Point group: D2
Chain length 259, copies 4
């Protein structure tokens, strides 16, 4: 038998809303593997859900941070430094684009909506990686969540496609810059999973059924499959893997035209 024991390890998981959150799926596996887990949630309105998540993990520290707010980010990492001392793992599971940007055409994206989507969904990784850098121990890691539309056009995903392209390029540069400290940086490209944010993509259910039709495994992936890949990449089992975008999508993205 192989055991993954992360006793002694400290994890901060940013971007949890409820138990369907992919950030949460990774937090669960990290806690199960023995790490101490802190969750960050976006706004006070989400505190009651974050409390339920801490409880479902059997214990987790909670912190409020909006990634557009540099003061709140400073306070987060100050709080994590005080509670943990050093940090091993950082999970970045945050994305946003304004409803109107997702519902219209990409070409019709308003300037301030476009910038907000990039700010929240891509710049935030840089914001948190910079603040995490002095805390992160040798062997530690940052993992983010991205989607195939960075490479190929998925209708209605619009500015998020572009944010994910910026997010993946960021992963490579941060991997290059944090690598000498023995800190790894990777992206999980997840296939469609029915989360809270899934409702924000028009035609998500079409995407979802389409993936299950065409993917090599002829099924959608699960939250736990994302959780397990996040666990692996953060664990010492993945000690030689950095700067990568690793797909957990039942093979969907390798497919060209079928039927």
């Amino acid at each position: 038998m192989l055991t993954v024991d992360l006793s002694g390890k400290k994890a901060l998981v940013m971007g949890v809303t409820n138990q369907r959150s992919l950030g949460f799926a990774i937090a669960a596996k990290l806690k199960e593997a023995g790490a101490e887990v802190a969750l960050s949630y976006q706004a006070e309105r989400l505190r009651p859900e974050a409390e339920k998540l801490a409880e479902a993990l059997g214990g987790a520290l909670l912190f409020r941070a909006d990634v557009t707010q540099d003061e709140e980010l400073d306070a987060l990492f100050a709080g994590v430094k005080e509670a943990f001392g050093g940090l091993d793992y950082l999970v970045h599971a945050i994305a946003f684009a304004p409803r109107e940007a997702m519902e219209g055409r990409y070409i019709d994206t308003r300037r301030q909506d476009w910038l907000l989507a990039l700010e929240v969904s891509a710049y935030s990784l840089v914001a948190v990686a910079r603040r995490a850098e002095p805390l992160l121990r040798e062997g530690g890691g940052i993992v983010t969540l991205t989607y195939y539309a960075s490479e190929k056009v998925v209708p209605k995903y619009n500015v998020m496609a572009i944010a994910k392209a910026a997010l993946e390029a960021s992963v490579r540069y941060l991997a290059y810059e944090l690598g000498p400290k023995g800190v790894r940086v990777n992206a999980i490209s997840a296939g469609p999973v029915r989360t809270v944010a899934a409702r924000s993509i028009p035609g998500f259910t079409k995407m979802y059924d389409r993936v299950a039709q065409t993917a090599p495994l002829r099924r959608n992936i699960t939250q736990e499959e994302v959780g397990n890949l996040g666990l692996f990449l953060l664990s010492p089992l993945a000690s030689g893997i950095t700067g990568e975008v690793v797909y957990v999508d039942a093979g969907y993205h390798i497919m060209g035209m079928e039927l």
Copy 2:
């Protein structure tokens, strides 16, 4: 001999500073091919030189527009519409990132520097495509300029790599959205060329040397090689090509280790 005749065609080329500007290389080829060319320049400061470029083309309309100013962009496309009635070609040859963003580590990029880089270097394609769309005729096209660092780490290119990654994904979505109206969208991935903007990349000389050492052709590309590719992509010869990032880099980007 085969002929590329763009008589009757109207081009807008955005982002010329001087005669070494990649956008100007594409402008010169479109003009030589017989197209009528309008140029846009960033700021009143650049006007005297913009006029020298208009002159080197044997005439070109000039418009000033900073792509962070939506009203300047509105005015620019009102001006083009009045002057030309419509448009066939749009060249987007615009990028910027603060000096501090390019001198430091990517991880140390300040929020507002990061956002400005993406706004000027990527969002601008969207802002100009939207405005050009009602003017753009069937057979028409948009071409932008990118660099390999979108795909692979080129140290110190930093936030511009991320902006180019955004630019390239923008090219794909914009190709998808404009294609039904018969308008193509492509990016040219140029290798290093000594332009005014190259002086804003600290390691440029090192990059230039690596390319000459490593590239299949054992040399750097030229301004004219960029111009010729832009001409081709905008021309009817490229009528089947859209959503593409085409490399003009002497083969550099296909090389691994040597």
Copy 3:
């Protein structure tokens, strides 16, 4: 106007069967630009129609060569050497996989069928590049044809996808090796075109109609669009471009879903 003038340039186009052949489209454009074009065809049974193609091009030189027969390849380049003295352009428009391989599953491909597919569709490029190398002039080039199934799974393209992956990797290595000599090597990734070879892909008509529905341009490409890209890549207008796979597919391969 710009003029592409290839007067005095010499081309060999390998893999013509009929007027729909992609190699023929590129031959016709090279001839239009003023190049002298020789053609090669595979076997005696194809000679009558090949002669008609040669006649269509002002009476082009015609050679027989099966790329599995090294002796025929030697005779081909000896004959080209005698006729032209050297060579500027080489077009490689040749693929085959046995019917058994294409109609089954990839996993069920027989050893000998798989090897023949790779030999004809991938190794042949190395075989002709090697023999062309001493004839090839500075500024010269080789262009081959591929399909996006090298990167993405297209059911029933089977071993040919794998041969095309081998082909594209071959293009990168040959570009590296011929580059010092000022010879470029590139691939054209064409979208579906209704050629005689199309009948060898089960369900091709389904594939063709799907492209029209979902490509950015909401149509298939044409044989001529392939011919124009071949011309461009071989011409000095593309002098900065080597080791590339350039897609002419109406944008199809950029679409991720639907």
Copy 4:
């Protein structure tokens, strides 16, 4: 603590010569995790090491099979079926190119050498996948080993690069074809590790030493890092992952320059 218990599961690992073999590292992890392992070695001359490897694992069935020999492959899988009744995991850690193909230029590769390289290094995945299919249980998988020269030119890796492009394309097609039964197919793209075979790449030590200087992690990967990725991809932890080429190279291949 989270556990991976592969008790009850059966593995065939093909291509061990050495305790430094990447195939052996994967077998060691599979055995650690609880799996019953079978090993195939190439030739009678490797029996004694094979036996010591089987000792090192704590016991392992041994078989001899040359991947060019269909009868030896049929006997392998009949033997495996007899001993295990079914298979859960197949590791394909086999590659070969003739010395002469590796030592010069890709363009100079002789027909027989090119074919054999493709036959042993790419076709063998299909041959073994076909024979494994009826034995392979739902949740089962196949993992192979590749190298980044499939996408980027590494001089002197030559035909092996082309074989790896074929292999990775084969992984995508076999993943598609085996996916319906709940069987996954993936590739590990390893960075340089000092094995017997590494020495058959001219300049390997300098390639090895260069990675340690330029990789994001500023070191080479270890045999154990490959073994852990193999274990992960074959285990249920990777149940959502198929058709993937996963890089374990200390980030080396993300670098674009310097």
